[PDB]
């Protein structure tokens, strides 16, 4: 049976959305969510709209939700297949947390990136921040506007 917790979280997402975030369940799959996060004001991603997908696996909420960026983005925490490096999506998940926490955390990651982890983009952000920010802006113009 579909866990009551998933039904209630879905209702809550529809009734009280997170500002700057759209999140809707897939018509064919109640465990599958289509998410859009607006690029935060004053960040390198300002003006962009970023598509993500989220999936609630069998053992949710004991296991974390899985989340993938679908829109190409230049960010210390997002690898080349869109996988997100975020502690509460791995080690630090707990059933005390919920979908809304994950969505707010990703928005927060975009608003003010923190490059300490380890990968080429994080390294650029640490030692050549100006270029990293310009590249993130360029990719927002190129991939997050249409």
């Amino acid at each position: 049976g579909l866990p009551r917790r998933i039904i209630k979280e879905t209702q809550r997402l529809l009734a009280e959305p997170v500002p700057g975030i759209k999140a809707e369940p897939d018509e064919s799959n109640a465990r599958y969510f289509h998410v859009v996060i607006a690029g935060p004001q004053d960040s390198p991603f300002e003006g962009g709209t970023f598509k993500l997908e989220l999936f609630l696996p069998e053992e949710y909420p004991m296991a974390a939700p899985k989340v993938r960026f679908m829109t190409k983005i230049y960010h210390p925490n997002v690898d080349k297949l869109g996988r997100i490096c975020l502690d509460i999506l791995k080690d630090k998940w707990s059933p005390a947390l919920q979908i809304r926490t994950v969505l707010l955390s990703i928005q927060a990651l975009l608003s003010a990136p923190n490059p300490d982890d380890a990968n080429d983009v994080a390294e650029q952000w640490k030692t050549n921040e100006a270029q990293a920010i310009e590249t993130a802006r360029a990719w927002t113009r190129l991939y997050a506007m249409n």
């Binding site: 064919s28 465990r31 997908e53 696996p57 679908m70 297949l81």
Partner: protein
């Protein structure tokens, strides 16, 4: 539990990196930066006590936009004489391979490659004359 394509193929990527125990089949992305997760490579070691024995077969597997609802496409790069494999293009005829002919959405790249390996084990294939080792299709 239905796993949507974009998450299923990331699972299959991690499983392929982990590999099966004995290395008799393997799979991975053709381009490990391919966001669409569409084009994969496969590897089958020819089974023992057959005319395929010990030979390394390289394959190309395509997981289209409707995978895993729709079966993947499969092509041998290494030339192989085996029922269902076109002897000039290496393409695998889905009608000839039960796992593809009767595809179900719980199947996976691993399952397809293991099925092809089991089929090289069959009475109909195991004694088929084979081309000189190493040959490939145009």
């Amino acid at each position: 539990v239905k796993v949507p394509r974009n998450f299923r193929l990331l699972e299959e990527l991690e499983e392929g990196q982990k590999g099966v125990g004995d290395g008799t089949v393997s799979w991975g992305l053709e381009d490990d930066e391919d966001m669409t997760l569409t084009r994969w490579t496969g590897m089958i070691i020819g089974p023992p006590r057959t005319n395929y024995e010990n030979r390394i077969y390289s394959l190309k597997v395509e997981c289209g936009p409707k995978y895993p609802e729709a079966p993947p496409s499969v092509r041998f790069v290494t030339k192989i004489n085996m029922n269902g494999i076109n002897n000039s293009s290496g393409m695998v005829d889905a009608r000839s391979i039960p796992v593809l002919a009767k595809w179900q959405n719980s199947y996976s790249i691993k399952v397809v490659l293991q099925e092809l390996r089991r089929l090289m084990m069959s009475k109909e294939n195991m004694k088929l004359p084979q081309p000189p080792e190493g040959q490939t299709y145009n």
